[PDB]
Amino acid sequence: TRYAGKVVVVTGGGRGIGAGIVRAFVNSGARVVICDKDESGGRALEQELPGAVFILCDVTQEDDVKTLVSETIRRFGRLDCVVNNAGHHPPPQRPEETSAQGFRQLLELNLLGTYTLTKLALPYLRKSQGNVINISSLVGAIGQAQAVPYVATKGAVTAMTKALALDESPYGVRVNCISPGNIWTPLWEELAALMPDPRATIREGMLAQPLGRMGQPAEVGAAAVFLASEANFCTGIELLVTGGAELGYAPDI
Amino acid sequence: TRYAGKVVVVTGGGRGIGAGIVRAFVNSGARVVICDKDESGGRALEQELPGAVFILCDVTQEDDVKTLVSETIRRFGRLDCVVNNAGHHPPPQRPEETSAQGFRQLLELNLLGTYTLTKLALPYLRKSQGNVINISSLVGAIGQAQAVPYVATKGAVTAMTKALALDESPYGVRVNCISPGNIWTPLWEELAALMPDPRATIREGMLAQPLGRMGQPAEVGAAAVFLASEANFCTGIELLVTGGAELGYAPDI
Amino acid sequence: TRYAGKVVVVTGGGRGIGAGIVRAFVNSGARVVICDKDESGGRALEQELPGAVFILCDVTQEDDVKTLVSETIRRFGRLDCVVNNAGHHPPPQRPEETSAQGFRQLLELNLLGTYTLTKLALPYLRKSQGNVINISSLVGAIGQAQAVPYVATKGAVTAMTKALALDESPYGVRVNCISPGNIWTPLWEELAALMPDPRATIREGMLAQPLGRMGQPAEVGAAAVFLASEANFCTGIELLVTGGAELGYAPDI
Amino acid sequence: TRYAGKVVVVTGGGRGIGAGIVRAFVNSGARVVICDKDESGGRALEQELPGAVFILCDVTQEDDVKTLVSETIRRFGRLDCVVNNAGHHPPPQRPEETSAQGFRQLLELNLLGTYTLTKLALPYLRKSQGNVINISSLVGAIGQAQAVPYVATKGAVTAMTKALALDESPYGVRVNCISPGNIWTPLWEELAALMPDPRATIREGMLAQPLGRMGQPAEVGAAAVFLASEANFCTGIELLVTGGAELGYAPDI
Ligand SMILES: NC(=O)c1ccc[n+]([C@@H]2O[C@H](COP(=O)([O-])OP(=O)(O)OC[C@H]3O[C@@H](n4cnc5c(N)ncnc54)[C@H](O)[C@@H]3O)[C@@H](O)[C@H]2O)c1
Ligand SMILES: NC(=O)c1ccc[n+]([C@@H]2O[C@H](COP(=O)([O-])OP(=O)(O)OC[C@H]3O[C@@H](n4cnc5c(N)ncnc54)[C@H](O)[C@@H]3O)[C@@H](O)[C@H]2O)c1
Ligand SMILES: NC(=O)c1ccc[n+]([C@@H]2O[C@H](COP(=O)([O-])OP(=O)(O)OC[C@H]3O[C@@H](n4cnc5c(N)ncnc54)[C@H](O)[C@@H]3O)[C@@H](O)[C@H]2O)c1
Ligand SMILES: NC(=O)c1ccc[n+]([C@@H]2O[C@H](COP(=O)([O-])OP(=O)(O)OC[C@H]3O[C@@H](n4cnc5c(N)ncnc54)[C@H](O)[C@@H]3O)[C@@H](O)[C@H]2O)c1
Ligand SMILES: Cc1ccc2nc(C(=O)c3ccc(F)c(O)c3)ccc2c1
Ligand SMILES: Cc1ccc2nc(C(=O)c3ccc(F)c(O)c3)ccc2c1
Ligand SMILES: Cc1ccc2nc(C(=O)c3ccc(F)c(O)c3)ccc2c1
Ligand SMILES: Cc1ccc2nc(C(=O)c3ccc(F)c(O)c3)ccc2c1
Ligand SMILES: OC[C@H]1O[C@@H](O)[C@H](O)[C@@H](O)[C@@H]1O
Ligand SMILES: OC[C@H]1O[C@@H](O)[C@H](O)[C@@H](O)[C@@H]1O
Numbered sequence A, B, C, D: 001t002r003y004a005g006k007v008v009v010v011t012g013g014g015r016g017i018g019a020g021i022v023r024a025f026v027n028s029g030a031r032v033v034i035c036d037k038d039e040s041g042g043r044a045l046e047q048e049l050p051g052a053v054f055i056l057c058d059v060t061q062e063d064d065v066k067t068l069v070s071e072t073i074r075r076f077g078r079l080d081c082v083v084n085n086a087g088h089h090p091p092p093q094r095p096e097e098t099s100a101q102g103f104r105q106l107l108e109l110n111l112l113g114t115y116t117l118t119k120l121a122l123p124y125l126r127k128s129q130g131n132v133i134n135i136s137s138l139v140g141a142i143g144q145a146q147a148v149p150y151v152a153t154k155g156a157v158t159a160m161t162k163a164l165a166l167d168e169s170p171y172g173v174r175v176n177c178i179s180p181g182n183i184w185t186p187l188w189e190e191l192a193a194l195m196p197d198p199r200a201t202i203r204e205g206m207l208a209q210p211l212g213r214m215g216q217p218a219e220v221g222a223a224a225v226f227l228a229s230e231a232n233f234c235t236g237i238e239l240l241v242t243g244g245a246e247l248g249y250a251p252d253i
């Protein structure tokens, strides 16, 4: 009952972290709108979860997002929390192999899609004293190899979260982000499968954490439910869900 | 039921943030040992809360802490979480008014008391796959005026949390900290009362947060229950409970 | 002589921080290419400074940047340091007053212009074991009110700096950023002039720093010369030039 | 001539990083007082460097530090910069192998010695508009394995630097810290020699940095001269000299 009576939109909710966040909110008593550009996972999740419904929406398309918000309000009468989870990590790319074109496309998804939904949702979040949760990335803070565009987009999300928290504080709307590290999801599996030795890549990904494993969508979901339902004095925070990966680390020429 | 069957020790649990943490854990289903050097608040809290008991213990006294741990195990049979909350903020002091003697005394409480209980508790936390929660301070990260010793002690706590998280990760024990900002507690009230215009000082303390108020012990308590019970992929994190105080901020000579 | 024989490109070098960086590098013995989209300041600076030349270049235009690099190499035979300083802060804008269109345009300048020049320069920086210096912003790290797009762009720059530092480390190219706070420049003067009480706004800007004044272009310039010429074990750092602005900060409802 | 006419005290200046800092300041034109508890290195350094003199002083002994300051003023007539470099890293120690006694002793050196000299020097630094430079450690920020006391002491130093910067800003005294990573010094060599395979330990220490080597005392020294002589808008900063070590990092159970 921690979030009973509330209405939550989760973008990219059809699989991976997003689906874990959907499940955590349904388990907390909320009604959840699953937004995804892909019908397969999200439609099945609606059938599985009473309290969740699926709305096809590509967050890079402004009119899709307008309809997502208007349909959420039409169907459920309020909006309490937006979780901006839709995002992508390209395959590893050396800096000279990236392009401004690809960088712009990744900004459209990872940054501007979050911006667009948040902007359209904020009038309703102000009415409900609701909150925004952005899914950023640990590597926005610490960097990652072979990922210049991705890292830039996530540094932008974390910073934007802090700016918006300042602007929306007088109106009672909290704005926070979660920065996951290595979470075992279909994206992780897909990227590993591109590598010469996928099993070795996966093993390395597990050992990057002091805890010796990758994280689960459910663990990101629990962090999101905490931020929405019990973190009433938290705004503009970056909540790390990383298993400790950021901890620790002639001869001098 | 989020933490049912678990046993938690909260130091400085007789009033303020510590009492809020005690209440949050009792509400989650845990049994709680209230440690305090002062009988008044903690004894009343035991009477009030089924599931909480009071043990007199000054965390700066090694034998008191040894007895705290042995009595917790004798009475409850396990130990799952230690919350190192006991600590103090001296009245505002200019650097030249501080002393090495006073600095050492504050280190004994704010830093070494946390170290001592954690060390004595860790064998039991390893058996239960339990966790440590240290109550640090936002100003350990960002500084504060007229508080050189206090700030130093809290920078030490936050750093120590990260080091211990690394060391205890192979054993399945997570170690995290909460960094509160301005929380309305008897300590805050006592410090304000020393100032020339206490009401003005309190007003200034409220407006230091974008949220326009100070935080509550209950909000720190909810963050602690989250870290203990649902943050299984979080270790070595600093969870800010500050209301956004860290956000934002000839002419050039 | 600290940077004698070296060749430096400074974008946005015609006024403000960029001109201060140009002067600092000329004073260190380097030859400097002043890039700017505006001829007025940069052309005068060339006439004033032996060792500096002006090249008209809008960093948002890929062909302009290609020509900037090819002309630098044609005229000077090497390239040792790129300082990505061109950038803009829009007038204060509430989140609901911003647009995706304006956000994209600001990303083109503050983020993608930095990306584009860095990419085109890197083959030459690898040959010289040179370095990249990005001018980010303190508010990328801590947030700012009425500046969601700006803050996002600068969070991206700081993060991108760390990612590129990782990628270019095997090749001996260091990549660092400077995050200024309030620096008294024509941009600051222009933004203040839009406000109802410009003098009051300027006074507030000075008092945001514990040092009680704004910074100077020359101080950012000295930090840049340090990073280029003497910081050989620094890569991926964020060097704050802020005057301490990030330091420090019923009642509980 | 960057720091000509100025007087600098470097603690632990007889070898390692401290000796590198001494050399960098002498090369900048300053007169330097080498403080050390060990005569061997510091006495030889005085003989070698015109402009440097050696004063025997154990920074944990208050009367030694009082004499250090009074002798500096008696001999040189002013004091412009204090570099608190004396410190120690114990051999790797598991948390259960540490003691409160050893922790207190390490606090006396790494934290309280810095506090004591700074306090005694500040009246003179206010007269000269001088500055304080504390040598902290990257692992104060990110943690390290088998080093709970050390990490705590360095977290305290970094935090204390920020608090004192706030307090001394109205008086025109800047207070900054440098956080080195792996620097090749006699301490590093001594710790490696205790390990089963010292050469393997050294190799691992080099590869912890993206730059693929450890740092040099001279590089820390250049950062110190920058902070003293050219960073006039920097106070309360943590300048990382780490080679990038902090950058970057069933399957989910
Ligand atoms: N998996 C990790 O290790 C990891 C680490 C750090 C951060 N993250 C972040 O977590 C989020 C989720 O990652 P994941 O691993 O679950 O990814 P995933 O690819 O498994 O799932 C992403 C989901 O988002 C949907 N989506 C993609 N583009 C969309 C669009 N334009 N509109 C709507 N939906 C869209 C996909 O169809 C998919 O269902 C992303 O923001 C990612 O950057 C993931
Ligand atoms: N109140 C704030 O704004 C604030 C802000 C940041 C951090 N904190 C931290 O939160 C913690 C609690 O602060 P608070 O405001 O509730 O303080 P408080 O003074 O109201 O309560 C502290 C409690 O700890 C007990 N205690 C003190 N010394 C002890 C000792 N040696 N052994 C055992 N118990 C001892 C006291 O008797 C008291 O019951 C402290 O670590 C403090 O530094 C508080
Ligand atoms: N002034 C501050 O307080 C402050 C604070 C933090 C960061 N910064 C950053 O410092 C940098 C310089 O700021 P400033 O205050 O000196 O600004 P400014 O407006 O005074 O100077 C910027 C210069 O860049 C040039 N420029 C703008 N767009 C360009 C383009 N497309 N191509 C090439 N040149 C272009 C302008 O013509 C101008 O000469 C910017 O990145 C800014 O975001 C400034
Ligand atoms: N070497 C590294 O990798 C490294 C990394 C991070 C931080 N640091 C810090 O840099 C500083 C210097 O380290 P180093 O590697 O050069 O060490 P080092 O042991 O080589 O040199 C330390 C010097 O300080 C002196 N000293 C020790 N105790 C003293 C006391 N009580 N009073 C006066 N002088 C005293 C020693 O005699 C010696 O000359 C320390 O604060 C250390 O924690 C070093
Ligand atoms: C082969 C490969 C490369 C890079 C990958 N990166 C991620 C990722 O998104 C991520 C990971 C850790 C972080 F700390 C983080 O912030 C993000 C996932 C799978 C990968 C697979
Ligand atoms: C007159 C006064 C002065 C300083 C005080 N400081 C605190 C405190 O402990 C605290 C506050 C904010 C933080 F961000 C923080 O980390 C700690 C409480 C009451 C005070 C009253
Ligand atoms: C009226 C106004 C509003 C906002 C302004 N902001 C800046 C700026 O660029 C900046 C400032 C501080 C920082 F810490 C920072 O990172 C950036 C300059 C002038 C302004 C004038
Ligand atoms: C065998 C061993 C173990 C640990 C050591 N640690 C240091 C050290 O002081 C240090 C290193 C990196 C940092 F990032 C840092 O902050 C400090 C030096 C030698 C060592 C040798
Ligand atoms: O594909 C990797 C993992 O992705 C997660 O989102 C699913 O919940 C797991 O069942 C699956 O093993
Ligand atoms: O004394 C200030 C506040 O302290 C808190 O710990 C109590 O829960 C409040 O009831 C009280 O108003």
Ligand SMILES: OC[C@H]1O[C@@H](O)[C@H](O)[C@@H](O)[C@@H]1O
Binding pocket: C015, C016, C017, C184, C185, C186, C187, C189, C217
């Ligand atoms: O316009 C504000 C300031 O801008 C700086 O870039 C110039 O160097 C100053 O002379 C001027 O006062």
Ligand SMILES: OC[C@H]1O[C@@H](O)[C@H](O)[C@@H](O)[C@@H]1O
Binding pocket: D015, D016, D017, D184, D185, D186, D187, D189, D217
């Ligand atoms: O002992 C390791 C290193 O220590 C440094 O302080 C010295 O300057 C080097 O010559 C020496 O190789």
Ligand code: NA
Binding pocket: A045, A046, A047, A048, A049, A050, A051, A052, A053
């Ligand atoms: Na359903």
Ligand code: NA
Binding pocket: B045, B046, B047, B048, B049, B050, B051, B052, B053
């Ligand atoms: Na009871």
Ligand code: NA
Binding pocket: C045, C046, C047, C048, C049, C050, C051, C052, C053
């Ligand atoms: Na010229």
Ligand code: NA
Binding pocket: D045, D046, D047, D048, D049, D050, D051, D052, D053
């Ligand atoms: Na000499």
